[PDB]
């Protein structure tokens with residue numbers, strides 16, 4: 001009833017609720033929001049590919 | 065006529081008649097819990113809105129905007145003199161016409177009573193002066 005729930009249903013439910021609540025705030029009809037994300041993605045073309053894992057770490061920081 | 069809750073001088077809350085069935089929806093839930101478990105945070109979630117703007121009875125407070133009101137006033141070649149014709153237009157389409165007169169009211173009828181019949185005659189020269 002302890003660690004196997006934290007690393008199981010109860011723990012993953014809290015993780016899912018936290019992550020899904022973040023994603024629910026990103027779906028709203030707004031021109032400025034989607035334009036910023038489109039233009040931001042252009043940096044993947046500019047950046048050298050070795051920086052992908054740093055962008056991955058930065059994105060996980062923003063989830064918090 | 066009378067200031068009511070859904071209609072007054074400054075705004076109205078217009079609702080159309082509902083063409084569709086009054087469908088009942090109860091027990092709203094997601095895959096992580098019921099609606100009441102997250103309804104506190106659902107104000108930030110646009111996908112959690114229970115009221116649809118296409119519904120005929122959706123509440124909208126609309127300010128009562130004056131329609132395009134034009135003074136076709138005395139200083140205008142169309143008006144044959146002094147006529148403050150007030151027109152409420154929809155673009156150029158006339159919706160209501162309010163002719164304001166008295167800009168040439170000179171009290172001829174009042175003045176005539178103070179004149180003899182011979183003296184009052186020239187007043188008639190100046191009513192329809194063509």
Ligand SMILES: CCCCCCCCCCCCCCCCCC(=O)OC[C@H](COP(=O)(O)OCCN)OC(=O)CCCCCCCCCCCCCCCCC
Pocket residue numbers: 006007008011012014015018019060063064
């Ligand atoms: C033997 C059985 C084996 C099977 C088990 C396998 C699952 C093991 C994983 C266990 C880890 C999840 C369980 C513990 C998570 C608990 C989440 C949580 O409590 O939220 C923490 C915090 C929000 O704070 P709050 O919960 O409100 O209060 C603090 C309570 N002390 O918010 C947080 O800090 C959460 C961290 C933010 C989210 C980080 C996201 C990282 C990337 C997602 C992780 C999964 C990656 C999957 C990738 C593919 C997905 C398609």
Ligand SMILES: CCCCCCCCCCCC(=O)OC[C@H](COP(=O)(O)OCC[N+](C)(C)C)OC(=O)CCCCCCCCCCC
Pocket residue numbers: 008009010012013014016
């Ligand atoms: C890889 C090694 C083998 C592991 C096999 C898979 C086990 C997965 C954990 C069980 C989850 C479960 O059963 O999901 C069912 C549970 C039910 O939760 P509940 O008891 O109703 O409490 C929840 C409600 N409360 C707290 C209010 C009472 O829904 C959840 O929590 C939703 C989160 C789903 C996450 C699923 C991700 C699975 C990833 C698997 C690989 C990491």
